[PDB]
Design a protein around this nucleic acid. Structure first.
Ligand SMILES: [Mg+2]
Ligand SMILES: [Zn+2]
Lengths: 62, 213, 136, 101
RNA sequence: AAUUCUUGGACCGGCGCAAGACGGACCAGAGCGAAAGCAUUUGCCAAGAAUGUUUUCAUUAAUCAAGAACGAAAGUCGGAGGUUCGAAGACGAUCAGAUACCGUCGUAGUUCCGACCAUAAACGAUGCCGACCGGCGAUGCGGCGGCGUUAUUCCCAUGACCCGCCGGGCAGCUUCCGGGAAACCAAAGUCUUUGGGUUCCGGGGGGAGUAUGGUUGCAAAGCUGAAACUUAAAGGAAUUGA
RNA sequence: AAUUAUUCCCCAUGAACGAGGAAUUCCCAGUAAGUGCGGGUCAUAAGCUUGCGUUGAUUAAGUCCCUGCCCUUUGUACACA
């Protein structure tokens, strides 16, 4: 599947077992309106880019 | 050490003229090896097809049962057996703070077929209603149920099976009952929940081949 | 081994009865009639341990073998008839229901129409276990 | 000592209510004593929906739901954390917990 | 996990047939009943509270020793039935042991008809009748008044909502009515400012609901029911700890 | 006063050890670690400890999953608990 860019728009909350994954609201650079929720490792900032291997799957919001 | 699907003929299934999409799908049978015959073993198979698939595209919550009452040649000819609403629909309708009214009539068509029709209807909450409940008193319930039976009998009794299926393809019976019971207590989610087949007349072929065009 | 349907567009439909108890999973394809069986791969045929007959894993293996087995006979798409145990017992499907339905969609089949067909009784016979239930 | 006013149950002016089998055990609890719960669930969980949204023959077929009504005995309800113990003051609060999302 | 079931095709899918149980969701702090209790449709039979009344009789009433009707479940005797479940049983596990909890079968029973039985945390742990004493919003049945919406299109008139009022009923929230050891209670109030009427019944804890007689029962057992002896506490609500 | 070599020096002898099993420790900035220099003991005297500077990072700005301890609610026939 083509690799697609999701842009962090608003960092929401921290998740995982040991508080290790930042759960972030992403706004797609490809489609104008589609905004999904993704679990992300490492430190992430409000207003930067992610390279998603799939642009359809969504993580369970808490 | 015998591949058991080597001796299997596929047969195309045909629905009667009352539906848009004719052919339902395919059916497996064993080749006539010994005394027991492919077509005779194939005769009396019940196919439960959703009306969405049976028409082109519509309601998917109403299902029709169809019996292969005869086989002409590489073609199963099905005929209306029964009808049933889907679990999802019936479970979704039945919700709390209202009265559920159920009727059943044992009525016979002009030709041999004697059906058992089950009607269901739920008391509707008014547009400006502030009272939570919206229940019907017992005499209001059995006046509604008496009227349910009176329409359900009248609609089938006087015409033949080709026309009763033409009424069950929409829900003309349920819409007629719903409008009729507006004075006693306004119902909303009124359908003919289920149609059963108790008796058929002794099989004819000329009567089948009028239903198959 | 020859469904004489058209190569381009024509989908040949089966119907898959996924009986998912809390200690076994069945995946069982038949005719639209429901009379003639094509496949039946249980959760227990695949794995050899009693404690994981009702596994998402075992149900995933079972649905994969069913998908592969029915692709050869020429069943392209499937209608679905999911059920728990029912009667007096549980009416929530087993933990293998999800993984099996997922598995024969990951394995390149087509999904027609789905519905619950659990034996829901009007009112039933007395349930197993005493008046005081299953105490543990 | 008297703990509840309505003796842990929603019977007031009957005398007898027919019992029900618990859905975890098969323990006989009265119809109104039991902790009832109505689970409306999608057949396919969360991610399976996307795989069956693409590998479906039809055009926007709103895949069906699973309606299951569950009766728990008080012990089964507390053990499964369907209910919990409460303060003497909070016990009287009958307004069910908010389900905003 | 094993006991058990199965290539003499079990479990699974399909179409039929038979049997005996039970009446899901709708089903609620809703209804009815003296209490136990009572839920698929329709018909027949007799009864009933509440409301309505410018009808009738005119004290006929309230509570009750004796005596009497009904009385869940289990239990007993005789007949019919035996699908599910299942005391005793038989094994399979678990454990130090397990005569248990867990599992596989499973007899009496579970169901109906006719005779006994008469006890339950039979509970509101709260006799029945009558009067007075705060507030509020719902709810079920009956009656009454009232903008308007809606179904009979043809709207008079009937139902479905809407807003109040009156009488009974299941309840609810609130309060320095007042009471109480407190918990809590519009009754558990109107109690040292003690009397409206009337039935049952308690007198520190054990022995003991035991022995003995008498009585009812086919039996199990029911009703009535002590003493010697023993003991400084047992107990009820609430507080701080652990 | 040195054999059971106090220490130090000179030549000769050249062992295992090829990055370490279960398990487990300390640590977020001039910090970890590498590196040496002083103080203590001290007639003799640092593989220890207590201080000092020099070179100088990777990772993280989070959580209750693990191990601890601490609180609130609830239950009690416990109160030398
Ligand atoms: Mg009772
Ligand atoms: Zn339980």
């Amino acid at each position: 599947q083509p690799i697609k860019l999701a842009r962090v728009t608003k960092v929401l909350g921290r998740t995982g077992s040991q508080g290790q994954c930042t759960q972030v609201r992403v706004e797609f650079m490809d489609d104008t309106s589609r905004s999904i929720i993704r679990n992300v490792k490492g430190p992430v900032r409000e207003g930067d880019v992610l390279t998603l291997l799939e642009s359809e799957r969504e993580a369970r919001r808490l | 050490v015998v591949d058991p699907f080597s001796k299997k003929d596929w047969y195309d299934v045909k629905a009667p003229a009352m539906f848009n999409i004719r052919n339902i799908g395919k059916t497996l049978v064993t080749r006539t090896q010994g005394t027991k015959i492919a077509s005779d073993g194939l005769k009396g198979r019940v196919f439960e097809v959703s009306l969405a698939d049976l028409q082109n595209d519509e309601v998917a919550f109403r299902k029709f049962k169809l019996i292969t009452e005869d086989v002409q040649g590489k073609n199963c000819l099905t005929n209306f057996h029964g009808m049933d609403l889907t679990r999802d629909k019936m479970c979704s309708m039945v919700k709390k703070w209202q009265t559920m009214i159920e009727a059943h009539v044992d009525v016979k068509t002009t030709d041999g077929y004697l059906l058992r029709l089950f009607c269901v209807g739920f008391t509707k909450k008014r547009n400006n209603q502030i009272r939570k409940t919206s229940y019907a008193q017992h005499q209001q319930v059995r006046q509604i149920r008496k009227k349910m039976m009176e329409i359900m009998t009248r609609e089938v009794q006087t015409n033949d099976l080709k026309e009763v299926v033409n009424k069950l393809i929409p829900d003309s019976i349920g819409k007629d009952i719903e409008k009729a019971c507006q004075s006693i207590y306004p119902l909303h989610d009124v359908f003919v929940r289920k149609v059963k087949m108790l008796k058929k007349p002794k099989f004819e072929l000329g009567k089948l081949m009028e239903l198959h065009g | 081994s020859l469904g004489p349907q058209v190569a381009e567009g024509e989908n040949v439909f089966g119907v898959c009865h996924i009986f998912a108890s809390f200690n076994d999973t069945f995946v069982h394809v038949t005719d639209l009639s429901g009379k003639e069986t094509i496949c039946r791969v249980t959760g227990g045929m695949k794995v050899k341990a009693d404690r994981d007959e009702s596994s998402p894993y075992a149900a995933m293996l079972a649905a994969q073998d069913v998908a592969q087995r029915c692709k050869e006979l020429g069943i392209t798409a499937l209608h679905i008839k999911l059920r728990a145990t029912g009667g007096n017992r549980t009416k929530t499907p087993g933990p293998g229901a999800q993984s099996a339905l997922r598995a024969l969609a990951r394995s390149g089949m087509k999904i027609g129409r789905i519905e619950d067909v659990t034996p829901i009784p009007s009112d039933s016979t007395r349930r197993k276990g005493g008046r005081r239930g299953r105490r543990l | 000592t008297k703990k509840r006013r309505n003796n842990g149950r929603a019977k007031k002016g009957r005398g007898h209510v027919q019992p029900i089998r618990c859905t975890n055990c098969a323990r006989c609890v009265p119809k109104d004593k039991a902790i009832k719960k109505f689970v409306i669930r999608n057949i396919v969980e969360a991610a399976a929906v996307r795989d069956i949204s693409e590998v479906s023959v039809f055009d926007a077929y709103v895949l069906p739901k699973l309606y299951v009504k569950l009766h728990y005995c008080v012990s089964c309800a507390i053990h499964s954390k369907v209910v919990r113990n409460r303060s003497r003051e909070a016990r009287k609060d009958r307004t069910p917990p908010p389900r905003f999302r």
